[PDB]
């Protein structure tokens, strides 16, 4: 049951936009809402509006009086001397709650005229006509206007609606909540050479009487929220999908072949999401818009998605096809379960984020294989256990503070840190995988189909929300639908992993009792760390003995420590028979390293990742080597690679080398075995016999049979030896001699890989392989032996580093004339120049990176150069570079770059709270408090980034470096 927090119900909204002026960056328009009051004596009506100048408001064609105030413009007063962050977080939460449409509130308060009170008490319709104007928007609509001359279509100027969550208040007045569903009528009067893309279906396109402008009329009969309404106006090249004909793809001019190749996969994503769920795609059209200077890499609205143009690749670009493919897939998953089925509160957001991430993981499983699915699930689980042990924990479904261990309030999406938002979505889809583990996948897809079917029976009624609230899901409704389809309720699993905000830590060690033939496990939990919680459920453990692989369920109550499980025979060591594996197959194992008295070959605690856990198991090194070689699970091979770094014995070198030589191993395991072999080789110097590690293996796999030092000409058509070939010198460059310097046998090998590179014969590009070659050249740089702080000049350069510097100079200059796909070699060469500057080789001068961080460059070059400037101002304690970065945060045209500068200055801070630095003035505290209070008031993501930066630099209490 859904009861509105608003005293009115909104039925229909007309959004008309005229006079989109690109020179002056200005729009004019009106908005006409059709509300039905649910309570009599409505009097004031409270709507949401930011940055719009409200000209006039007429209610039922009668002139009404409005008052506007935004408390989130300046959160705390300018003349308050408070400088602690808990004060700002409480004031910012109160300010966002005072404009919240999820309460009754709002920023624009319109007073109902007196003569309509007899129209409002007996509950009859009210039609509110606001007309507004955006004079030069700092948020919401982003105007990308290039400085080439010509007409606005000839130079490539466009507008798009940017922002996250409820940010539609930034470009027209609305009820900007996900729970106020209404039908829509959208008119946009644009130039005759431009096209206006928006939500709904385009009913017509009429000309103006001078035929210089045309009006696009859109209609949206599926009741969506105001937060799902978008806009993209530009000189877009239109491409109808040749497979599905209601799907149109819009790109920027001159990028039509890239659009043709890139969006050619999307029909398979549509077919997948419509056959695992049994509902068809709910909207009547689908539109993909590719734009420049995007807010996020992929945004999903109702019947529309806005991607950045940096996803567009051609047919000869690999290492970008899977990333763009999965961006399209998660946009479509959010089309199904973020835009059609919406949110009932700010709680129950974990339901939608979990269903979106879970069905996108099912797509990844079918498309890229179960092994890529397991690797992705393991990397997401490692991400969340790292974040939750780092700071507190992520609390899905809080109850309204519920989480006081962290420096922001979790009551609203616009007060969350961006890393918390990312980990929120990550934990939501892992908890949905856990619900699939308890209640099987076919019942899970039946739950999702029941939700979609209730929403689509709801979506066709005309009753104003008598039935339109069946399109809003809640937690209680989701659990009730689960209990309807399965008969089991998941309330212990919901109580543990949703309502409680923690992950578990397992420390395991075994001992084999030879007398009674049992395996005595010893599993203890660390439950006193700040991020942890105590697990009391069951726990699966998989033991591989000589007779095969056996699963055991252990009951781990609070007082439990020793778990005795039984062991089988050892009669497959009496005769040589094959040892049967986890799957149905069996292999020949070399049992010379195994103990004579124990049959068990390896043990895995929680193999299926059925809890949110971090396992620290103490096996013997031969058990880790057997688990690396003969396991049929990629997460166990990865964890054995990760645990073999502590055992540098030559049997582990043989194990990793046999993994590296082995095709029919998953390629991301061999790419990890490269770096593990490099670390082991560094640890057993003065024992290593022959050549450096992986060199003979590289010449055996990727070089000519007649010439060992000449590499084969590039043929990248295998896509697994391409990735292994481009990752093996990067790990090989981490080799070090007894003198702690990279050997001149590996550096010469990398330089010969660079010289003899011929790419005139493959059908694929070479930009990522050459960029990884520059990364391998950067990995070999050891710190220089400066004497008496000698100035680093050209004559006293290292003889090794002069070759590296010549190569990166040649590569960067050749990129200036023949550019790569996304300037990958510019990014790699800037990263390598920063590596050479971090050691004492090149003079520590930020002027090159400051010239590459200007506005007109590509955004990857910009963020690489700004990363180099952030690293410089951390190491050299530069005041003027920090003022340069803070000025670039305040006034840069691209808001993604501002968010990225705040992000990089949070990750690599110039000082922490513990450090005494020269950059701990009252002036810097006043600048960052002014940046939290004012200055970042237009983005909701820059303000949370400024809160994160103030927390990283000065902590939760009063800045110490202050009177």
């Amino acid at each position: 049951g859904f009861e509105s927090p608003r005293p009115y119900k909104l039925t229909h909204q007309v959004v008309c936009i005229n006079n989109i002026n690109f020179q002056r960056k200005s729009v004019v328009g009106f908005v006409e809402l059709t509300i039905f009051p649910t309570v009599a004596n409505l009097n004031r009506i409270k709507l949401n509006s930011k940055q719009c100048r409200i000209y006039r408001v007429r209610i039922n064609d009668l002139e009404a009086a409005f008052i506007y105030n935004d408390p989130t413009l300046e959160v705390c007063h300018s003349e308050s001397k408070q400088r602690n962050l808990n004060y700002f977080s409480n004031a910012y939460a109160a300010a966002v709650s005072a404009v919240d449409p999820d309460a009754g509130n709002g920023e624009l308060c319109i007073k109902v005229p007196s003569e309509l009170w007899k129209h409002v008490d007996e509950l009859k319709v009210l039609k509110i006509h606001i007309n507004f104007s955006l004079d030069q928007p700092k948020g919401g609509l982003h105007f990308v206007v290039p400085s080439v001359e010509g007409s606005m279509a000839e130079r490539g100027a466009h507008v798009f609606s940017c922002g996250y969550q409820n940010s539609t208040r930034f470009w027209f007045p609305c009820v900007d909540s996900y729970s106020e569903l209404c039908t829509w009528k959208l008119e946009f009067t644009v130039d005759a050479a431009m096209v206006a893309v928006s939500n709904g279906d385009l009913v017509e396109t009429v000309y103006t009487h001078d035929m210089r402008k045309k009006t696009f009329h859109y209609m949206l009969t599926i009741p969506t929220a105001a937060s799902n309404i978008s806009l993209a106006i530009g000189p877009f090249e239109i491409l109808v999908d040749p497979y599905m004909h209601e799907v149109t793809h819009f790109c920027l001019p001159q990028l039509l072949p890239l659009l043709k190749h890139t969006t050619s996969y999307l029909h398979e994503v549509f077919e997948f999401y419509e056959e695992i769920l049994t509902c068809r795609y709910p909207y009547s059209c689908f539109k993909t818009v590719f734009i420049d200077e995007a807010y996020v890499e992929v945004a999903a609205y109702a019947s529309m998605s806005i991607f950045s143009t940096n996803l567009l690749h051609s047919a000869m670009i690999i290492d970008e096809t899977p990333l763009t493919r999965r961006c399209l897939a998660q946009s479509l998953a959010q089309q199904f379960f973020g835009c059609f089925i919406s949110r009932m509160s700010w709680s129950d957001e974990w339901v939608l984020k979990g269903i979106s991430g879970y069905i996108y993981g099912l797509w990844m499983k079918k498309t890229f294989g179960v092994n890529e699915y397991r690797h992705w699930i393991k990397e997401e689980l490692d991400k969340i256990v790292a974040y939750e042990l780092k700071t507190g924990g992520v609390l899905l479904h809080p109850i309204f503070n519920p989480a006081s261990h962290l420096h922001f309030s979790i009551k609203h999406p616009h007060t969350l840190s961006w890393e918390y938002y990312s980990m929120f979505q990550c934990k939501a889809h892992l908890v949905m995988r856990l619900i699939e583990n308890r209640i099987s996948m076919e019942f899970m897809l039946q739950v999702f189909n029941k939700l979609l079917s209730l929403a689509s029976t709801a979506s066709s009624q005309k009753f104003q929300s008598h039935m339109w609230s069946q399109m809003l899901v809640s937690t209680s409704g989701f659990l009730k639908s689960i209990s309807n389809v399965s008969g089991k309720d998941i309330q212990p699993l919901i109580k543990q992993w949703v309502d409680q905000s923690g992950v578990v830590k397992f420390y395991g060690s075994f001992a084999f009792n030879r007398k009674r033939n049992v395996l005595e496990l010893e599993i203890k939990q660390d439950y006193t760390s700040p991020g942890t919680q105590k697990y009391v459920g069951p726990l699966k453990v998989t033991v591989q003995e000589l007779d095969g692989s056996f699963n055991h369920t252990l009951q781990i109550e609070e007082n439990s420590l020793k778990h005795d499980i039984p062991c089988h025979s050892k009669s497959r060591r009496n005769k040589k028979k094959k040892i049967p594996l986890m799957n149905g197959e069996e292999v020949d194992m070399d049992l010379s390293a195994m103990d004579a008295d124990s049959p068990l070959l390896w043990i895995r605690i929680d193999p299926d990742m059925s809890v949110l856990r971090k396992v620290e198991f103490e096996q013997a090194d031969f058990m880790w080597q057997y688990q690396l070689r003969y396991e049929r699970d990629v997460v166990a091979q990865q964890e054995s690679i990760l645990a073999l770094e502590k055992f540098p014995t030559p049997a582990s070198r043989l194990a990793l080398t046999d993994i590296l030589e082995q095709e029919q191993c998953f390629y991301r395991v061999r790419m990890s075995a490269c770096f593990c072999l490099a670390k082991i080789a560094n640890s057993m110097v003065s024992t290593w016999t022959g050549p450096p590690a992986m060199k003979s293996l590289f010449t055996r796999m990727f070089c000519c049979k007649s010439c060992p030092n000449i590499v084969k000409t590039n043929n990248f058509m295998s896509f697994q030896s391409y990735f292994l070939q481009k990752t093996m010198p990067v790990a090989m460059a981490l080799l070090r001699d007894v003198h702690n310097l990279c050997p001149k046998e590996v550096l010469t090998f990398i330089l010969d890989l660079i010289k003899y590179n011929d790419n005139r014969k493959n059908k694929f590009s070479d930009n990522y392989y050459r960029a990884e070659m520059i990364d391998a050249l950067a990995n070999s740089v050891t710190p220089a032996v400066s004497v008496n702080n000698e100035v680093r000049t050209l004559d006293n350069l290292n003889p090794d580093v002069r070759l590296i510097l010549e190569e990166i100079t040649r590569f960067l200059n050749m990129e200036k004339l023949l550019p790569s796909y996304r300037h990958t070699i510019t990014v790699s060469c800037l990263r390598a120049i920063r590596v050479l500057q971090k050691n004492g080789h090149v003079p520590s001068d930020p002027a090159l990176f400051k010239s590459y961080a200007e506005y007109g460059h590509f955004v990857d070059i910009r963020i690489a150069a700004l990363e180099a400037v952030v690293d410089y101002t951390k190491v050299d304690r530069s005041y003027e570079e920090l003022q340069w970065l803070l000025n670039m945060i305040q006034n840069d045209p691209v808001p993604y770059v501002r968010h990225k500068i705040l992000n990089m200055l949070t990750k690599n801070p110039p000082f922490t709270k513990n450090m005494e630095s020269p950059l701990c003035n009252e002036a810097l505290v006043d600048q960052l408090w002014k940046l939290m209070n004012s200055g970042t008031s237009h983005d909701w993501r820059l303000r949370c980034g400024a809160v994160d930066l103030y927390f990283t630099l000065f902590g939760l209490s009063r800045p110490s470096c202050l009177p």
Binding site: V370, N371, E372, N583, G584, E585, Q664, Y667
Partner: peptide, 13 residues
């Protein structure tokens, strides 16, 4: 750009 998960060797059915 493709499957690249050697699935027939890890999960044979």
């Amino acid at each position: 750009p493709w499957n690249l998960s050697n699935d027939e060797y890890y999960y044979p059915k």
